[PDB]
Design a protein around this ligand. Sequence first.
Ligand SMILES: *[C@@H]1O[C@H](CO)[C@@H](O)[C@H](O)[C@H]1NC(C)=O
Ligand SMILES: *[C@@H]1O[C@H](CO)[C@@H](O)[C@H](O)[C@H]1NC(C)=O
Ligand SMILES: *[C@@H]1O[C@H](CO)[C@@H](O)[C@H](O)[C@H]1NC(C)=O
Ligand SMILES: *[C@@H]1O[C@H](CO)[C@@H](O)[C@H](O)[C@H]1NC(C)=O
Ligand SMILES: *[C@@H]1O[C@H](CO)[C@@H](O)[C@H](O)[C@H]1NC(C)=O
Ligand SMILES: *[C@@H]1O[C@H](CO)[C@@H](O)[C@H](O)[C@H]1NC(C)=O
Ligand SMILES: *[C@@H]1O[C@H](CO)[C@@H](O)[C@H](O)[C@H]1NC(C)=O
Lengths: 930, 48
Amino acid sequence: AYTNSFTRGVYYPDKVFRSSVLHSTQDLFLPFFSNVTWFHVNPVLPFNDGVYFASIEKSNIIRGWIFGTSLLIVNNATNVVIKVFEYVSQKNLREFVFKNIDGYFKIYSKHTPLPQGFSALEPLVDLPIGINITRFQTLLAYYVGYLQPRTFLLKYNENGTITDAVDCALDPLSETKCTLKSFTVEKGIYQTSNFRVQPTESIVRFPNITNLCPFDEVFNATRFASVYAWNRKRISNCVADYSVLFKCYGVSPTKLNDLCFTNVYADSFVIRGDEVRQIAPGQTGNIADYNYKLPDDFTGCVIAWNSNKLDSKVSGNYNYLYRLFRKSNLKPFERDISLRSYSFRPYRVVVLSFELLHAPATVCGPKKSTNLVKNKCVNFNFNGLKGTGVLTESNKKFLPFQQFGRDIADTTDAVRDPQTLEILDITPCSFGGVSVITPGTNTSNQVAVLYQGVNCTEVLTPTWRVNVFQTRAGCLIGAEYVNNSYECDIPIGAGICASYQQSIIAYTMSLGAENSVAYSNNSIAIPTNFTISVTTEILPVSMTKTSVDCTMYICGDSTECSNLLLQYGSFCTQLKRALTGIAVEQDKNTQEVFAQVKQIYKTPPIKYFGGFNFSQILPDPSKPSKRSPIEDLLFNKVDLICAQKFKGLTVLPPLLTDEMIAQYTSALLAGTITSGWTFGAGPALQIPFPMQMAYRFNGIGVTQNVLYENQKLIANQFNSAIGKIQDSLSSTPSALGKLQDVVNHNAQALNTLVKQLSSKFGAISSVLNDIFSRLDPPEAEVQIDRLITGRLQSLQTYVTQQLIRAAEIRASANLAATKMSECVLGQSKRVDFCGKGYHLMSFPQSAPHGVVFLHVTYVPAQEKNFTTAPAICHDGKAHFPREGVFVSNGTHWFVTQRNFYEPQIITTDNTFVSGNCDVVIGIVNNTVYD
Amino acid sequence: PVSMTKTSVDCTMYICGDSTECSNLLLQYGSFCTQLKRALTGIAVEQD
Ligand SMILES: *[C@@H]1O[C@H](CO)[C@@H](O)[C@H](O)[C@H]1NC(C)=O
Ligand SMILES: *[C@@H]1O[C@H](CO)[C@@H](O)[C@H](O)[C@H]1NC(C)=O
Ligand SMILES: *[C@@H]1O[C@H](CO)[C@@H](O)[C@H](O)[C@H]1NC(C)=O
Ligand SMILES: *[C@@H]1O[C@H](CO)[C@@H](O)[C@H](O)[C@H]1NC(C)=O
Ligand SMILES: *[C@@H]1O[C@H](CO)[C@@H](O)[C@H](O)[C@H]1NC(C)=O
Ligand SMILES: *[C@@H]1O[C@H](CO)[C@@H](O)[C@H](O)[C@H]1NC(C)=O
Ligand SMILES: *[C@@H]1O[C@H](CO)[C@@H](O)[C@H](O)[C@H]1NC(C)=O
């Protein structure tokens, strides 16, 4: 019988209290939705890595368990009895988790008065036992599941209770949740992991020679050569079994059976005891200078054993001579047989040298050999060259002295088979990135998966599996390709986007609606109306000013680390200097954006401006902050601090307060409302607002009367647009994404810096006191230096990224200052610099870390077709319009301004004469009234 | 110039490249590869 484990089996991984957080734990868990064995009410079940044991009964039928390949637990009303050591202490679902880790036996449990719910198991007992549990059996409907190494994302409420968990490896959505460290996923595409084709078989290819090497002749020879004339023997074409046989250089003896050698030579002699220390690289002495000198870069093994009952003589042996005088010290592996005696009375040394650097293998250890598997991802081993990949028949042309082929990275990419002598390419097994496309968990749990840079024929590391489509970006699984084209929702790549239609669809993105302009050589479209448009532009100006405490981040009130940290010195001095430069740059950015005017202009008491209503951008006196309603909305629209501060990371306040920035903004607004563009170029010259509007209409080539004749309509359009600004900002949550992105970048950088303190950087632990109170001080300094270099590197990376982000923010602030000068303090002719349309004016509003420009532009509307001519022929003279264009109803001919239909009688006062009617192409006969 | 090549790096494959022992050792160096992946993803998005 089998059942679903649902989301049961979660226990508390430690004794730590965590409050209202999400924590990631690697531990032995019961995988979600596992297949759990079911029993009704006693087989002997295995104990693989720990056990989840649940039961649903109302009669206490189950009583205990016996653990062993011994340990016994019985739950009796008197006490629960544990016996191996001894210990004594103490329908409804009862769940237990049994683990045997690090010599300790741990039991977690819970009781609930399988169900489709979540309930964590609190720890029950920990016992020092020490036995090797391999099987277990219950003692008396119970369910059994098995633990596996897994990463879980557990959520702790404010009470420290685990209320939910995510099994990261269960499915793509869970992997995305674990990647984002949240239970909620916004719509988008997320790089989650890498897929890698896993090897199927392990192949071994060693030479077929099965003869054993003549080691015994070297070692068991009755007499050994004298050290001055040491013997050298070549080992070739044999199996070297080192178990028959010890200081090894460049290799470990316990691994010597697993490697292939090429130039192996045994050098044998007999020496006098202590000079054993002189058979070594670099060593000096009589033997190491005049008899036997090893290379500085010597790899191989020196094996020496005392031969007392082999060579000792009661009279003094004279068979072993040595060179006691010489001109100059020998070169490595150089012999001189051109001399004293030891006179041994009541040590044989052999030096094995070999080359492990590629080359054909002449001597190989005993490893057996298997078949040669091709076209499949396998773990291969060619003469000691281990690896994983696909082996294919080659078109390369090797040479007899060549055994391996190498690529740019000095990586072996082609190999000659030791037996068949064929050449094989080695490619790595197929792999790539994996992206998850989600419409958002608030919408659906449905996902699509993109395997990047890989076609669908080879689509494993993610261990989950998942409406198959091929794109230049890779293989898309879980999305249906539709022939319709929509605006891009989730970008996939190469023109392919994804969207949530009930289902996930992939499509070719559209660039917009096709449009054809009715072009002809004599037709012109002229607007007859206009719309006053007010658009919003949001610009970051400054970032958070950050300061870092050197020792508090690196050491954290540890004195040995603090004393060790002064061996670098200039590092964090320059780090603090860079951060201080960034902070003063932030204050400079704010100053250059908002302090353009030196007078603080006040808005007049009476707030009549010819029908224009500025109440939503002017300061609101009732509110204590004196902010405008739109500024109020902006500032509402955008314990961790203390925790970061306790690690040396603090935030400095900006020099200008939000109130002072609001004062600057209100001064700019009052200046522009009461004096137009004059206060930017000199003394503020007052002018009625309708007259300033007429000036700005003249700026964009529209005559003044157009605004005076449409004053009420223009004011109403402006008021309506300003009122819609509030709704557009408030309804849209993504409106202020730039400033929030600045805030989130700062927060993410700080969080990364904080979480790098748990990084060990390859040391025993990430805690200094553990290293200092559990290790020799000579090695404690080494490991603490490892940690210190890691943390200093983290700080330097943080500062470098802060400098790059500060440069980007400085560019943004320079652009904002330019827009303040050119869009707020004047009227700009630069296309699209101050909003879409013909710029009229702009109003600044302060925002938490930036500025918001409200651009008021003139957009032509209600265009009409007319027939046009370059010139009008009259009295043999060509007339060209002075400040307009010639248009026609169809019968009569007028002249009009270009951006607003205002037909006028063609007179000699709105045209000018140039030449006859013989050169201009398209000239039209008509009357020019005088 | 308007954009540059969008690059992605498989941190483990570059550093270790089929060596599982190297991967286990590399898992002890923290979120280095996570930071690099985030930075490169930001660059790639900025190109588009
Ligand atoms: C993937 O394999 C299919 C089938 O052989 C092939 O048509 C396709 O071109 C391959 N992908 C690429 C990128 O070449
Ligand atoms: C002017 O446009 C018309 C229609 O678009 C075309 O037939 C005519 O050839 C054009 N004029 C000249 C000189 O080509
Ligand atoms: C211009 O458009 C406005 C709406 O913005 C409308 O009330 C007005 O009647 C229009 N005028 C003309 C001449 O079409
Ligand atoms: C200006 O607009 C606000 C908001 O729409 C409104 O409450 C106020 O009465 C208006 N003032 C005038 C003078 O129309
Ligand atoms: C101008 O004429 C073209 C072709 O006759 C037509 O497609 C277009 O809609 C006209 N424009 C207006 C504003 O009516
Ligand atoms: C031509 O313009 C005059 C305006 O003075 C008037 O007859 C009419 O608006 C136009 N004719 C036609 C057919 O539209
Ligand atoms: C315009 O007038 C001139 C001379 O008066 C004549 O030659 C020409 O043909 C006229 N244009 C048209 C389109 O009739």
